[PDB]
Amino acid sequence: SRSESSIENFLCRSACVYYATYTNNSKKGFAEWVINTRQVAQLRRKLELFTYLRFDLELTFVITSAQQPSTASSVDAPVQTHQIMYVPPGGPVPTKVKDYAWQTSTNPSVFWTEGNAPPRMSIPFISIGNAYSCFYDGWTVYGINTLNNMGTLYMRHVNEAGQGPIKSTVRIYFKPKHVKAWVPRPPRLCQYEKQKNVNFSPIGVTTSRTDII
Amino acid sequence: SRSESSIENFLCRSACVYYATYTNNSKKGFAEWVINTRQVAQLRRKLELFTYLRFDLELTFVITSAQQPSTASSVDAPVQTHQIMYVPPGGPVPTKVKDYAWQTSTNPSVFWTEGNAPPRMSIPFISIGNAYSCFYDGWTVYGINTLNNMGTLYMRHVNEAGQGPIKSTVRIYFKPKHVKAWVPRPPRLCQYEKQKNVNFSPIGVTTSRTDII
Amino acid sequence: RSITLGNSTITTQNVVVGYGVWPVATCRFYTLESVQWMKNSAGWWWKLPDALSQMGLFGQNMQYHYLGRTGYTIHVQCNASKFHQGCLLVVCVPEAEMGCSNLNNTPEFSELSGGDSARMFTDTQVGESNAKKVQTAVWNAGMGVGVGNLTIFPHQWINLRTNNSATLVMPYINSVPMDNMFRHNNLTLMIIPFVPLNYSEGSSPYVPITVTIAPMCAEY
Amino acid sequence: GLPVMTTPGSTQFLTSDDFQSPSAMPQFDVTPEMQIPGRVNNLMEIAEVDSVVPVNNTEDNVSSLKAYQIPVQSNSDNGKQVFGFPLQPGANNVLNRTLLGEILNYYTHWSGSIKLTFMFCGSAMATGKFLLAYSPPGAGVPKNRKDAMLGTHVIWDVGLQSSCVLCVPWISAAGYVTCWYQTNIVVPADVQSSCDILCFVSACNDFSVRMLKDTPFIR
Amino acid sequence: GLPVMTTPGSTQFLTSDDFQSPSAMPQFDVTPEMQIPGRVNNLMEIAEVDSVVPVNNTEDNVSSLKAYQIPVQSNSDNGKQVFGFPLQPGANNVLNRTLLGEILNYYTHWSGSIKLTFMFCGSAMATGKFLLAYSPPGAGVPKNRKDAMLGTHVIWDVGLQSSCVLCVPWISAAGYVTCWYQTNIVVPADVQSSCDILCFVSACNDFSVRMLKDTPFIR
Amino acid sequence: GLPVMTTPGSTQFLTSDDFQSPSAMPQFDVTPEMQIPGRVNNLMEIAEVDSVVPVNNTED
């Protein structure tokens, strides 16, 4: 049995890489996430075995809501819609819940009402170079490599609150497709410290035993 | 790489060209919009590079609602439906929420309940002439050219309020299809002043530097 | 034996090439100045397209012409008599992103790469609150990885019992086909001693190690 | 009847989608086509034509026609810089508002060449010689007539031809296009001495743009 | 129009599903491929190469390079165990953190063989003989030189060759790979006596893994 | 796009239905078959063999 050890069957999985809350009335309630693989620790180790990757990307969002405590007088609200904006590398970036950057043209965005299927979208491989680089010995600051910038995400409501606020959560999933790997690496032994870089503390090689025999 | 600079891939985009609110009980709550490309500034510059255009049109509407503050006694409302009427150039025009012009025959209109997919409709190229004209040196008043009149839009509820009012918003999108352009123009340098015409204030050519060398 | 390039001659007599693939006065065998292997040594490393640039006419090609494509070959040989014992590991890691001693910063430039001068490892930890220094404890090999697993890269064992030398050939491994050489170091040559050098009384107490680099097909 | 299964991403509205649509007005009998001259199939046909470059900004000739003119007169010093401008992309250089620059601000990465065509619109009798030194990126700006002659250049004469063509690569210091007096401008009597010089810019070969964005020349 | 019927499991989101998807950015003209050396098509190409085994843990040589070295010296006793380690899978044995072990902790059931390559990195003059006794599972650990000779083994000489190869099956007591002094290490004068020994591990034939899981070497 | 029309009995769950299903674990490489003796293809192969009849019940 060897088809369970191919590179395609080793990475084509899913993982809850982000989890953020945002409410509708607090004037700065909007979720924000930069796309990077180094968020969750268990996926970072599975992708740092190789150096140069090249994959498409497929995102799904599961969104739910929760009624915040209102005042009185029998609050009734219709269904909510959510807007999920995606910014390519080198584009405008919003800063409030109401800004010009949401009604722009070349930023693709979806609209999704509740009670339906979750809104899958799919991003192709966007780079000026030929492959993503999970390691970069060089300056751009050290070890940043501004070429492999995949873009950001932004979410907000498209409704105005009438009698009671509603907060909402979002769990962004993540799934590479058609993966090709290059020049493998030995697996990282020491624990992770900071998300942006490769820093570490020195640790022993292997949990000890009592003697040689 | 040149297929990203074709005319089809340069204009086949989307933009939130209108944003209006209307409530159901205030006896004049109905949204109204005339179709013209010169509403949003960022699309007007991308279309004034050419003089004679000819494109089909594809409109989508995203509609949401919001509960207005009612009195008391546990307001419960069923789902709302919205009516989006389209008037061709040279047709009747409503003036109140209840008029004869809504139940007319040759004005196509859609009906859309909430909680479903947003209601896309598509308008073909309607002109007596052969092409739209984004510039017209001549009288009909100066620089109007009543030939390239694309029609209007009108929206209202199809319900009567029982215990609490509901206001609603609408964000009309816009997408040309199968575009052909003719006789290009130099890009407009001075800022825009008025929506209906081409007036401007004189401005310098280029942000200066200190000297020639 | 006695291969020549340009105006330099190196005399040899096994080869291990890349990942299976094969790669005007610059074609000459540059020779870094040799380091001394003692008993209490830990290891040395050179960044590859930086050690050539500060000294050679290849570096004179670098300051005029930034962006280039190169393909290297490396000779490493140490001469010792039959009475010495010990074992080396010659490996050539691509994209060695080393980590800083301080947990929040990145190391500065002069600690990652001496200009054609070997930076040295150590077998302790290093201080953290001082400055931007490379975390250079040898058993984690600077990259936070287990040093025993380092043989997945192209490598060659030097063992003074039988073998004497090591020759490597490395092709051009980069994502972009043309990148600026001044802000990027794609290869890294590491020499780590596993079995430390031991000898009796009377013999000379150090073994010199010479490193010879020779670029082939530098395109500009 | 027939069994289906709704995949995720079903009732969503993608902003840059591609689907069919119901027509609002069927049985309309749309107006047919007409042969209208000057059809544009790609935006690089706009960037092929020439335009004049405002190389004489100097903070008060911007709101006039003196921004496009380079002053050249018979001075008393041998060896002097006529003009010079960097090629730093986007950051308020002189090639921004021209016809090449207004298209390329709709993109993020581009590469190509540039035809720089000069034109001596002076008298009919006066002669002289000019250098057109392009400094490659990485090298410095030349501070003399002599070292600019060692770099890549072209000596341009006035009495033979009235327009020289200089080609140069351009990509998103980074280079200079300085021009130097070779000799003074000898002119016969009863002719004015001060003459002007224009500048033209067009794309030599086809550019390669990608990853469209919106322009920053708006509110 | 056309009649359908929504089967159960319609508007659900399976975590490990497989469907199509709408592209977020059409008309992008994606960057084409490039021939980059060293492509990995399967993870068993990682497990084929060798790695050094930390067989000398002993609670204070772990944070140093003395974990990979086995001490061998000319002792005064004939018949002594040089080293020995069990093959109990996973439960803190010595083959866990090596390059073979880090892949196989991503699976639940596996089977294969192991090449154990030793290497005497001592002097050039000193000779000697070693046993490499593999004890099969079910049998006990040998407590003598003599009974280990009755089991399956291979006598390894130093003066002839410097590396012996021992192959052994491995599967998720369970076996021992003990090594014994055959004779003392005779070495001429003016040479040091204490010599070290390394250890290598790679997969002999192809393994057979199944039913992927996540690793326990994390927080 | 393509026009459909949902017939009645659409979003129901029949207890004895027959439809396809999404697999929970794709790329598993299921364990293959093995020749095991004594295969039963129908329950009447159980009823063909003999059995002893308790014809002497009589309460104790």
PDB file of N, CA and C in Angstrom, chain C residues 19 21 42 82-87 123 138-139 146-149 151-152 157 159-162 171-177 192-196 198-201 203, chain E residues 34 36-38 46 49-52 62-65 68-69 97-99 102 119-126 158-159 161-162 189-192 194-196 198 200:
ATOM      1  N   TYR C  19      20.822  16.986  -7.447  1.00  0.00           N
ATOM      2  CA  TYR C  19      19.636  16.170  -7.266  1.00  0.00           C
ATOM      3  C   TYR C  19      19.391  15.291  -8.482  1.00  0.00           C
ATOM      4  N   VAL C  21      20.659  16.170 -11.643  1.00  0.00           N
ATOM      5  CA  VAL C  21      20.803  16.947 -12.861  1.00  0.00           C
ATOM      6  C   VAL C  21      22.185  17.580 -12.898  1.00  0.00           C
ATOM      7  N   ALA C  42      33.865  22.656  16.408  1.00  0.00           N
ATOM      8  CA  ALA C  42      32.429  22.436  16.343  1.00  0.00           C
ATOM      9  C   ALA C  42      31.881  22.464  14.931  1.00  0.00           C
ATOM     10  N   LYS C  82      48.371   8.956   8.368  1.00  0.00           N
ATOM     11  CA  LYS C  82      47.611   7.774   8.737  1.00  0.00           C
ATOM     12  C   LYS C  82      47.362   7.664  10.230  1.00  0.00           C
ATOM     13  N   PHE C  83      47.959   8.526  11.039  1.00  0.00           N
ATOM     14  CA  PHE C  83      47.887   8.399  12.482  1.00  0.00           C
ATOM     15  C   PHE C  83      46.772   9.227  13.097  1.00  0.00           C
ATOM     16  N   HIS C  84      46.100  10.061  12.318  1.00  0.00           N
ATOM     17  CA  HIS C  84      44.976  10.823  12.832  1.00  0.00           C
ATOM     18  C   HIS C  84      43.680  10.065  12.601  1.00  0.00           C
ATOM     19  N   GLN C  85      42.681  10.373  13.418  1.00  0.00           N
ATOM     20  CA  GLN C  85      41.382   9.739  13.292  1.00  0.00           C
ATOM     21  C   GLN C  85      40.291  10.768  13.519  1.00  0.00           C
ATOM     22  N   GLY C  86      39.155  10.546  12.890  1.00  0.00           N
ATOM     23  CA  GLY C  86      38.043  11.470  12.989  1.00  0.00           C
ATOM     24  C   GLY C  86      37.208  11.425  11.732  1.00  0.00           C
ATOM     25  N   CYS C  87      36.043  12.058  11.809  1.00  0.00           N
ATOM     26  CA  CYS C  87      35.086  11.995  10.719  1.00  0.00           C
ATOM     27  C   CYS C  87      34.406  13.337  10.536  1.00  0.00           C
ATOM     28  N   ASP C 123      29.373  24.639  20.692  1.00  0.00           N
ATOM     29  CA  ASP C 123      28.668  23.522  21.303  1.00  0.00           C
ATOM     30  C   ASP C 123      27.960  23.912  22.590  1.00  0.00           C
ATOM     31  N   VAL C 138      25.298  23.665  18.101  1.00  0.00           N
ATOM     32  CA  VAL C 138      25.593  22.839  16.938  1.00  0.00           C
ATOM     33  C   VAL C 138      24.605  21.688  16.789  1.00  0.00           C
ATOM     34  N   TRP C 139      24.088  21.140  17.888  1.00  0.00           N
ATOM     35  CA  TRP C 139      23.232  19.969  17.762  1.00  0.00           C
ATOM     36  C   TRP C 139      21.844  20.297  17.238  1.00  0.00           C
ATOM     37  N   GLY C 146      16.979  18.720  13.767  1.00  0.00           N
ATOM     38  CA  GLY C 146      17.878  17.725  14.323  1.00  0.00           C
ATOM     39  C   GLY C 146      19.074  17.535  13.416  1.00  0.00           C
ATOM     40  N   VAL C 147      20.273  17.544  14.002  1.00  0.00           N
ATOM     41  CA  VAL C 147      21.491  17.503  13.203  1.00  0.00           C
ATOM     42  C   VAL C 147      21.723  16.115  12.621  1.00  0.00           C
ATOM     43  N   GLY C 148      21.092  15.089  13.185  1.00  0.00           N
ATOM     44  CA  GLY C 148      21.218  13.764  12.619  1.00  0.00           C
ATOM     45  C   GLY C 148      20.484  13.586  11.314  1.00  0.00           C
ATOM     46  N   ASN C 149      19.455  14.384  11.068  1.00  0.00           N
ATOM     47  CA  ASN C 149      18.676  14.267   9.852  1.00  0.00           C
ATOM     48  C   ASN C 149      19.213  15.126   8.727  1.00  0.00           C
ATOM     49  N   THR C 151      21.332  14.610   6.427  1.00  0.00           N
ATOM     50  CA  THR C 151      21.857  13.961   5.241  1.00  0.00           C
ATOM     51  C   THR C 151      20.845  13.867   4.115  1.00  0.00           C
ATOM     52  N   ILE C 152      19.679  14.492   4.255  1.00  0.00           N
ATOM     53  CA  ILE C 152      18.726  14.495   3.155  1.00  0.00           C
ATOM     54  C   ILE C 152      19.172  15.476   2.077  1.00  0.00           C
ATOM     55  N   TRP C 157      30.494  12.026   3.005  1.00  0.00           N
ATOM     56  CA  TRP C 157      31.220  11.798   4.242  1.00  0.00           C
ATOM     57  C   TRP C 157      32.715  11.834   3.996  1.00  0.00           C
ATOM     58  N   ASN C 159      35.883  10.676   5.953  1.00  0.00           N
ATOM     59  CA  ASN C 159      36.334   9.863   7.067  1.00  0.00           C
ATOM     60  C   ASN C 159      37.811   9.599   6.863  1.00  0.00           C
ATOM     61  N   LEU C 160      38.630  10.039   7.816  1.00  0.00           N
ATOM     62  CA  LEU C 160      40.076  10.029   7.645  1.00  0.00           C
ATOM     63  C   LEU C 160      40.684   8.638   7.689  1.00  0.00           C
ATOM     64  N   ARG C 161      39.901   7.612   8.008  1.00  0.00           N
ATOM     65  CA  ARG C 161      40.416   6.254   7.968  1.00  0.00           C
ATOM     66  C   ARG C 161      40.680   5.811   6.536  1.00  0.00           C
ATOM     67  N   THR C 162      39.687   5.942   5.660  1.00  0.00           N
ATOM     68  CA  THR C 162      39.838   5.528   4.270  1.00  0.00           C
ATOM     69  C   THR C 162      39.793   6.705   3.309  1.00  0.00           C
ATOM     70  N   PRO C 171      23.501  22.327  -8.767  1.00  0.00           N
ATOM     71  CA  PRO C 171      22.846  23.117  -9.805  1.00  0.00           C
ATOM     72  C   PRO C 171      22.157  24.333  -9.213  1.00  0.00           C
ATOM     73  N   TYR C 172      21.627  25.167 -10.100  1.00  0.00           N
ATOM     74  CA  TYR C 172      20.990  26.399  -9.663  1.00  0.00           C
ATOM     75  C   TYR C 172      19.588  26.132  -9.148  1.00  0.00           C
ATOM     76  N   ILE C 173      19.388  26.362  -7.852  1.00  0.00           N
ATOM     77  CA  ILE C 173      18.112  26.073  -7.212  1.00  0.00           C
ATOM     78  C   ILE C 173      17.471  27.354  -6.718  1.00  0.00           C
ATOM     79  N   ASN C 174      16.562  27.918  -7.504  1.00  0.00           N
ATOM     80  CA  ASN C 174      15.869  29.118  -7.071  1.00  0.00           C
ATOM     81  C   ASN C 174      14.505  29.171  -7.731  1.00  0.00           C
ATOM     82  N   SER C 175      13.586  29.870  -7.071  1.00  0.00           N
ATOM     83  CA  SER C 175      12.231  29.998  -7.589  1.00  0.00           C
ATOM     84  C   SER C 175      12.189  30.948  -8.776  1.00  0.00           C
ATOM     85  N   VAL C 176      12.587  32.193  -8.564  1.00  0.00           N
ATOM     86  CA  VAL C 176      12.665  33.154  -9.669  1.00  0.00           C
ATOM     87  C   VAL C 176      13.838  32.778 -10.561  1.00  0.00           C
ATOM     88  N   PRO C 177      13.711  32.849 -11.886  1.00  0.00           N
ATOM     89  CA  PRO C 177      14.866  32.524 -12.732  1.00  0.00           C
ATOM     90  C   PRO C 177      15.960  33.576 -12.708  1.00  0.00           C
ATOM     91  N   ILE C 192      30.588  19.829   9.466  1.00  0.00           N
ATOM     92  CA  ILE C 192      30.388  19.505  10.872  1.00  0.00           C
ATOM     93  C   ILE C 192      31.195  18.261  11.198  1.00  0.00           C
ATOM     94  N   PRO C 193      31.999  18.264  12.251  1.00  0.00           N
ATOM     95  CA  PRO C 193      32.689  17.042  12.665  1.00  0.00           C
ATOM     96  C   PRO C 193      31.873  16.218  13.637  1.00  0.00           C
ATOM     97  N   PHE C 194      31.560  14.972  13.293  1.00  0.00           N
ATOM     98  CA  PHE C 194      30.859  14.109  14.238  1.00  0.00           C
ATOM     99  C   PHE C 194      31.816  13.448  15.215  1.00  0.00           C
ATOM    100  N   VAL C 195      32.722  12.620  14.721  1.00  0.00           N
ATOM    101  CA  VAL C 195      33.745  12.002  15.556  1.00  0.00           C
ATOM    102  C   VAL C 195      34.915  12.974  15.639  1.00  0.00           C
ATOM    103  N   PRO C 196      35.244  13.490  16.817  1.00  0.00           N
ATOM    104  CA  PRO C 196      36.228  14.565  16.904  1.00  0.00           C
ATOM    105  C   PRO C 196      37.628  14.042  16.663  1.00  0.00           C
ATOM    106  N   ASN C 198      41.260  12.966  16.963  1.00  0.00           N
ATOM    107  CA  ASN C 198      42.075  12.461  18.050  1.00  0.00           C
ATOM    108  C   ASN C 198      43.401  11.971  17.498  1.00  0.00           C
ATOM    109  N   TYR C 199      44.445  12.109  18.306  1.00  0.00           N
ATOM    110  CA  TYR C 199      45.789  11.745  17.891  1.00  0.00           C
ATOM    111  C   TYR C 199      46.599  11.418  19.131  1.00  0.00           C
ATOM    112  N   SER C 200      47.801  10.910  18.911  1.00  0.00           N
ATOM    113  CA  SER C 200      48.705  10.622  20.009  1.00  0.00           C
ATOM    114  C   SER C 200      49.655  11.790  20.223  1.00  0.00           C
ATOM    115  N   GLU C 201      50.556  11.640  21.184  1.00  0.00           N
ATOM    116  CA  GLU C 201      51.544  12.668  21.471  1.00  0.00           C
ATOM    117  C   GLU C 201      52.725  12.509  20.528  1.00  0.00           C
ATOM    118  N   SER C 203      52.532  13.732  17.182  1.00  0.00           N
ATOM    119  CA  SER C 203      52.024  14.177  15.902  1.00  0.00           C
ATOM    120  C   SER C 203      51.586  15.632  15.989  1.00  0.00           C
TER     121      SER C 203
ATOM    122  N   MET E  34       8.140  25.947 -14.236  1.00  0.00           N
ATOM    123  CA  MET E  34       9.575  26.106 -14.391  1.00  0.00           C
ATOM    124  C   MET E  34      10.239  24.828 -13.913  1.00  0.00           C
ATOM    125  N   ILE E  36      12.445  22.903 -11.938  1.00  0.00           N
ATOM    126  CA  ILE E  36      13.186  23.073 -10.692  1.00  0.00           C
ATOM    127  C   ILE E  36      13.655  21.698 -10.240  1.00  0.00           C
ATOM    128  N   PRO E  37      14.933  21.520  -9.916  1.00  0.00           N
ATOM    129  CA  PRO E  37      15.446  20.179  -9.635  1.00  0.00           C
ATOM    130  C   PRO E  37      14.968  19.655  -8.295  1.00  0.00           C
ATOM    131  N   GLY E  38      15.014  18.336  -8.163  1.00  0.00           N
ATOM    132  CA  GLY E  38      14.666  17.688  -6.917  1.00  0.00           C
ATOM    133  C   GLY E  38      13.184  17.700  -6.623  1.00  0.00           C
ATOM    134  N   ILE E  46      11.736  10.365   0.804  1.00  0.00           N
ATOM    135  CA  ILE E  46      12.426  10.920   1.955  1.00  0.00           C
ATOM    136  C   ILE E  46      12.986   9.804   2.817  1.00  0.00           C
ATOM    137  N   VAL E  49      16.738   7.776   2.252  1.00  0.00           N
ATOM    138  CA  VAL E  49      18.085   8.235   2.557  1.00  0.00           C
ATOM    139  C   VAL E  49      18.421   7.901   3.998  1.00  0.00           C
ATOM    140  N   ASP E  50      19.688   8.027   4.353  1.00  0.00           N
ATOM    141  CA  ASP E  50      20.183   7.605   5.650  1.00  0.00           C
ATOM    142  C   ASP E  50      20.127   8.746   6.651  1.00  0.00           C
ATOM    143  N   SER E  51      20.295   8.395   7.919  1.00  0.00           N
ATOM    144  CA  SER E  51      20.368   9.371   8.989  1.00  0.00           C
ATOM    145  C   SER E  51      21.102   8.739  10.154  1.00  0.00           C
ATOM    146  N   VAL E  52      21.598   9.561  11.026  1.00  0.00           N
ATOM    147  CA  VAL E  52      22.403   9.090  12.141  1.00  0.00           C
ATOM    148  C   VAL E  52      21.491   8.883  13.340  1.00  0.00           C
ATOM    149  N   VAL E  62      22.508  14.160  25.613  1.00  0.00           N
ATOM    150  CA  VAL E  62      21.435  14.454  24.682  1.00  0.00           C
ATOM    151  C   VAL E  62      21.605  15.835  24.056  1.00  0.00           C
ATOM    152  N   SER E  63      22.019  16.833  24.823  1.00  0.00           N
ATOM    153  CA  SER E  63      22.178  18.180  24.286  1.00  0.00           C
ATOM    154  C   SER E  63      23.600  18.423  23.804  1.00  0.00           C
ATOM    155  N   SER E  64      24.135  17.490  23.025  1.00  0.00           N
ATOM    156  CA  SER E  64      25.487  17.590  22.494  1.00  0.00           C
ATOM    157  C   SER E  64      25.605  16.638  21.320  1.00  0.00           C
ATOM    158  N   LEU E  65      26.789  16.592  20.733  1.00  0.00           N
ATOM    159  CA  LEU E  65      27.063  15.662  19.656  1.00  0.00           C
ATOM    160  C   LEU E  65      27.575  14.329  20.157  1.00  0.00           C
ATOM    161  N   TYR E  68      25.439  10.670  19.283  1.00  0.00           N
ATOM    162  CA  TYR E  68      25.561   9.843  18.096  1.00  0.00           C
ATOM    163  C   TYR E  68      26.783   8.945  18.113  1.00  0.00           C
ATOM    164  N   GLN E  69      27.588   8.992  19.160  1.00  0.00           N
ATOM    165  CA  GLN E  69      28.855   8.283  19.199  1.00  0.00           C
ATOM    166  C   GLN E  69      28.790   7.141  20.199  1.00  0.00           C
ATOM    167  N   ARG E  97      13.187   9.897  16.578  1.00  0.00           N
ATOM    168  CA  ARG E  97      13.382  11.232  16.037  1.00  0.00           C
ATOM    169  C   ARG E  97      14.191  11.241  14.755  1.00  0.00           C
ATOM    170  N   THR E  98      14.622  10.086  14.263  1.00  0.00           N
ATOM    171  CA  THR E  98      15.394  10.047  13.036  1.00  0.00           C
ATOM    172  C   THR E  98      14.492  10.281  11.829  1.00  0.00           C
ATOM    173  N   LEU E  99      15.101  10.284  10.645  1.00  0.00           N
ATOM    174  CA  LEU E  99      14.373  10.670   9.442  1.00  0.00           C
ATOM    175  C   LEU E  99      13.377   9.603   9.016  1.00  0.00           C
ATOM    176  N   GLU E 102      10.274  10.059  11.743  1.00  0.00           N
ATOM    177  CA  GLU E 102       9.421  11.236  11.710  1.00  0.00           C
ATOM    178  C   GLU E 102       8.345  11.129  10.648  1.00  0.00           C
ATOM    179  N   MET E 119      29.510   2.103  10.870  1.00  0.00           N
ATOM    180  CA  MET E 119      30.709   2.692  10.291  1.00  0.00           C
ATOM    181  C   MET E 119      31.715   2.933  11.397  1.00  0.00           C
ATOM    182  N   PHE E 120      32.863   2.281  11.309  1.00  0.00           N
ATOM    183  CA  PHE E 120      33.906   2.417  12.318  1.00  0.00           C
ATOM    184  C   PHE E 120      34.759   3.612  11.944  1.00  0.00           C
ATOM    185  N   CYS E 121      34.532   4.736  12.603  1.00  0.00           N
ATOM    186  CA  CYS E 121      35.321   5.934  12.347  1.00  0.00           C
ATOM    187  C   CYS E 121      36.418   6.078  13.395  1.00  0.00           C
ATOM    188  N   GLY E 122      37.308   5.097  13.413  1.00  0.00           N
ATOM    189  CA  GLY E 122      38.413   5.107  14.346  1.00  0.00           C
ATOM    190  C   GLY E 122      39.717   5.381  13.638  1.00  0.00           C
ATOM    191  N   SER E 123      40.813   4.813  14.130  1.00  0.00           N
ATOM    192  CA  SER E 123      42.107   5.033  13.507  1.00  0.00           C
ATOM    193  C   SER E 123      42.230   4.238  12.213  1.00  0.00           C
ATOM    194  N   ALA E 124      43.367   4.398  11.553  1.00  0.00           N
ATOM    195  CA  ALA E 124      43.625   3.669  10.325  1.00  0.00           C
ATOM    196  C   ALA E 124      44.427   2.401  10.549  1.00  0.00           C
ATOM    197  N   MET E 125      45.068   2.256  11.701  1.00  0.00           N
ATOM    198  CA  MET E 125      45.900   1.094  11.966  1.00  0.00           C
ATOM    199  C   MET E 125      45.201   0.026  12.789  1.00  0.00           C
ATOM    200  N   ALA E 126      44.304   0.418  13.687  1.00  0.00           N
ATOM    201  CA  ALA E 126      43.764  -0.509  14.670  1.00  0.00           C
ATOM    202  C   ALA E 126      42.796  -1.489  14.032  1.00  0.00           C
ATOM    203  N   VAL E 158      37.291  -5.177  11.330  1.00  0.00           N
ATOM    204  CA  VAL E 158      37.648  -3.781  11.160  1.00  0.00           C
ATOM    205  C   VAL E 158      38.743  -3.613  10.121  1.00  0.00           C
ATOM    206  N   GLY E 159      39.738  -4.499  10.133  1.00  0.00           N
ATOM    207  CA  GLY E 159      40.880  -4.338   9.252  1.00  0.00           C
ATOM    208  C   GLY E 159      40.560  -4.562   7.790  1.00  0.00           C
ATOM    209  N   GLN E 161      37.153  -4.254   6.133  1.00  0.00           N
ATOM    210  CA  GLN E 161      36.235  -3.218   5.703  1.00  0.00           C
ATOM    211  C   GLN E 161      35.850  -2.368   6.899  1.00  0.00           C
ATOM    212  N   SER E 162      35.306  -1.191   6.617  1.00  0.00           N
ATOM    213  CA  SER E 162      34.986  -0.233   7.660  1.00  0.00           C
ATOM    214  C   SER E 162      33.491  -0.036   7.841  1.00  0.00           C
ATOM    215  N   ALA E 189      51.775   1.310  18.576  1.00  0.00           N
ATOM    216  CA  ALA E 189      52.209   2.397  19.434  1.00  0.00           C
ATOM    217  C   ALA E 189      52.074   3.736  18.719  1.00  0.00           C
ATOM    218  N   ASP E 190      52.036   4.801  19.527  1.00  0.00           N
ATOM    219  CA  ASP E 190      51.826   6.185  19.088  1.00  0.00           C
ATOM    220  C   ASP E 190      50.524   6.356  18.311  1.00  0.00           C
ATOM    221  N   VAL E 191      49.498   5.582  18.658  1.00  0.00           N
ATOM    222  CA  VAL E 191      48.132   5.794  18.191  1.00  0.00           C
ATOM    223  C   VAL E 191      47.230   5.751  19.416  1.00  0.00           C
ATOM    224  N   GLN E 192      46.220   6.618  19.447  1.00  0.00           N
ATOM    225  CA  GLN E 192      45.218   6.562  20.498  1.00  0.00           C
ATOM    226  C   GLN E 192      44.408   5.277  20.393  1.00  0.00           C
ATOM    227  N   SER E 194      41.026   4.771  22.083  1.00  0.00           N
ATOM    228  CA  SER E 194      39.576   4.908  22.134  1.00  0.00           C
ATOM    229  C   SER E 194      39.061   5.347  20.772  1.00  0.00           C
ATOM    230  N   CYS E 195      38.191   4.541  20.178  1.00  0.00           N
ATOM    231  CA  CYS E 195      37.595   4.840  18.889  1.00  0.00           C
ATOM    232  C   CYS E 195      36.077   4.839  19.001  1.00  0.00           C
ATOM    233  N   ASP E 196      35.429   5.539  18.079  1.00  0.00           N
ATOM    234  CA  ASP E 196      33.983   5.687  18.095  1.00  0.00           C
ATOM    235  C   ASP E 196      33.359   4.972  16.906  1.00  0.00           C
ATOM    236  N   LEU E 198      29.588   5.007  14.437  1.00  0.00           N
ATOM    237  CA  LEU E 198      28.314   5.620  14.096  1.00  0.00           C
ATOM    238  C   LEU E 198      27.268   4.560  13.769  1.00  0.00           C
ATOM    239  N   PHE E 200      23.574   4.050  11.105  1.00  0.00           N
ATOM    240  CA  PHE E 200      22.730   4.595  10.054  1.00  0.00           C
ATOM    241  C   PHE E 200      21.468   3.757   9.915  1.00  0.00           C
TER     242      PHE E 200
END
